[PDB]
Amino acid sequence: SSRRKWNKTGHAVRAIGRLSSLENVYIKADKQKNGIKANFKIRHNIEDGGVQLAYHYQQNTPIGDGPVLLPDNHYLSVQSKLSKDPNEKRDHMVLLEFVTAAGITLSKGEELFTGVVPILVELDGDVNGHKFSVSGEGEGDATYGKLTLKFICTTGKLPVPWPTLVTTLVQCFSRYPDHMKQHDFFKSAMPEGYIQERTIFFKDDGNYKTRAEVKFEGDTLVNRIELKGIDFKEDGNILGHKLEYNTRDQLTEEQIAEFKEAFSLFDKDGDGTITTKELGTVMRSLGQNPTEAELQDMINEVDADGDGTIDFPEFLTMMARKMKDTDSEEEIREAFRVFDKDGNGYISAAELRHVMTNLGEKLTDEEVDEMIREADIDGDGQVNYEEFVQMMT
Amino acid sequence: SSRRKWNKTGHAVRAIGRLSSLENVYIKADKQKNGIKANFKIRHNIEDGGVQLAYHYQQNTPIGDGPVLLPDNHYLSVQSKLSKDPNEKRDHMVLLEFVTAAGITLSKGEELFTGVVPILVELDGDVNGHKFSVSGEGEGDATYGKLTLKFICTTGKLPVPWPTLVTTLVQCFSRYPDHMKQHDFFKSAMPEGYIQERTIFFKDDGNYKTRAEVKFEGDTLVNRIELKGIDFKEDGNILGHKLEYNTRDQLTEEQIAEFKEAFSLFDKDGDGTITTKELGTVMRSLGQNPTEAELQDMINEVDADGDGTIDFPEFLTMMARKMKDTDSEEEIREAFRVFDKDGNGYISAAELRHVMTNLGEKLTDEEVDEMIREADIDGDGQVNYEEFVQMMT
Ligand SMILES: [Ca+2]
Ligand SMILES: [Ca+2]
Ligand SMILES: [Ca+2]
Ligand SMILES: [Ca+2]
Ligand SMILES: [Ca+2]
Ligand SMILES: [Ca+2]
Ligand SMILES: [Ca+2]
Ligand SMILES: [Ca+2]
């Protein structure tokens, strides 16, 4: 059938497409410059359709003279969410990002990143002679590869789209798993820092050239940037502001924080990854005693990088994944049965307290009572299955 | 917030659940019996809600005396689709399955499975003294881990649900990737065959005990089975026929075959996996010349087992994955541009012929014309973007 032929051919051509949209940041050593180089491409959606490609070429070199770590080839995987602050009248961008290194199979500088670190970002820009400045502030938590920042245009209206400045506006906050610690150039250059340079080519339009110094200034990690843009088209997608601001309709920041809180219950040592030991501990606390081999089988089924642990993005993938309605309903049934330890059909305050304390939460009886109250539609002091379903929905 | 607490706790409890629903068939050597053992659990959905668990314990030993391969620990991953033949009046089950071995990181008997092999299945059963028989016929294609069979109840009405007999009713058709060939017990026992025994425990209900001989009889692979079921409840989920027949609403058999046809265009040697060399060949034919390292990066992004190639289930996952509407639209735009080699906005018969011949299809001009005709709504002899969109939708 001609329709059969079109389908099978279309699938093949689309498969080529899915394979070659490499979204990752590919890093390799630049031994001559005692640093690293990277290349990657960003796909900016165009309002009302189409994509604007931005080809990135990157080089980093240390600012100071102490030895640094030069890596084997690897990549960073980035998930970014852009949003707006409803009360902010200035031109602005709120950003949440998670970045994790991978691609390799299983000190001083590192130690500076074990907790939450305040960030300042300053950019001075000139695009086609339009001068502008951006200031940003927020925090990074490398344990999770997490960045949270807000940026403001301090010169009025930004003359380019905010998404085009994301990559310019601190790869030292990437999570490198334990087996790749010796490949983390960025933290190895700290505190003295590194210079990051890029050229960014917007296809069929102009380019940005950037130079940044990234370093500690006391206890703050500061990214100070100069940007020059040339050859842009006045009514192209960049100077003409034709790019979409955010992706429809990425899972909410709130939901991410809820998942992070949940993840923390498993990651007992706060190292940003769940091990078989940690998963066993949680399961034991709730009365289930799988063997070490069974725990490893469990983790493997969701361990996308084969490092044998579950990191936060891997946990998010597992939790974000599409379930058939029947399956979602049964998963909620099963969760109810975990809470309802005596199997009588009602979750009591005692039972709730037991589950939360065993997971490792610290709640008073009064806090547990308030949780029951929020769910207890019929006022009997316990949470039945219908009430539980509404709470989880 | 109490709602925040419920969410975060619910997520944790559901995460435990997602981790521990190990669906895979876990295999290990049974050195004393010169064979293998396996254990796994099947979740049968109950009509109107709930799941009926079926705990499987399995042992296999060779029928003949020639040496066999005893494996390191590993697993099989199974995707099954059940359907009904609209013209079949007998109680019946149509089954499509894909089974692939994994879990290990990177002769005579094997050779018997390089092409499509006809299968006969015969079962004689006794459940709570209800005697019944099943006959099945179809084909297996181990290159893809693929089985296609139809089964009939030859004694009238089947006294148990068809899904409960699936695992009973030829693991020699599993795909073992090249790096795991020395761990394939099942093919190593051929042609003389193996005995497969199981006990299957249906929670809160009875059990099946099975014994099967699996072997070649001439050029047909035959699975001859005796099944005894005891301790079933008359109005339980099994004898009471309370189990759902098929999963809502798995991607169609037709669509799978279309994807298989597409996959075959890449898998030039017909070995059931796409290598970097093969992907490069296809991309080259269409005018794109990525380096070997780039091809490896491409494959890695979708290579879920880290073997460095893409097998058919991995291809299906890649193609089945949820895309945002904007992304789906842009992927179709991009595919149009591949077909429209001269960029004039119209795909000509010449251009279509070029794409299909380069992918490795063999079509006459008349067949290409018929494809254009099916898509060419406005009768100008070419396919414009709107026409292409309707064809791909
Ligand atoms: Ca941990
Ligand atoms: Ca992992
Ligand atoms: Ca209870
Ligand atoms: Ca209640
Ligand atoms: Ca091949
Ligand atoms: Ca693979
Ligand atoms: Ca054309
Ligand atoms: Ca036309």
Swiss-Prot record, chains A, B:
Asked if the Swiss-Prot or TrEMBL record annotates the protein with the keyword Lyase, the reply is no
Per UniProt, the keywords (alphabetical) are: Chromophore, Luminescence, Photoprotein
Phenotype when changing I46V: In EBFP1.2; shifts the excitation and emission spectra to shorter wavelengths and increases quantum yields compared to BFP
Variant or mutagenesis effect after changing N73I = In mut2.1; shifts fluorescence lifetime from 3.03 to 2.50 ns
Query: Outcome of altering I42T?
Result: In P11; increases fluorescence at 475 nm excitation and at warmer temperatures such as 37 degrees Celsius. In Esmerald; leads to brighter fluorescence. In VisGreen; leads to brighter fluorescence
Effect of changing V170N: reported as: In R10-3; matures to the red-emitting state with excitation and emission maxima at 555 and 585 nm, respectively
The effect annotated for Q182R is:
In Azurite; shifts the excitation and emission spectra to shorter wavelengths and increases quantum yields compared to BFP
* Quaternary structure annotation from Swiss-Prot or TrEMBL: Monomer.
Q: What family does this chain come from, according to its entry? A: Belongs to the GFP family.
Name of protein = Green fluorescent protein
Recorded name of the encoding gene? GFP
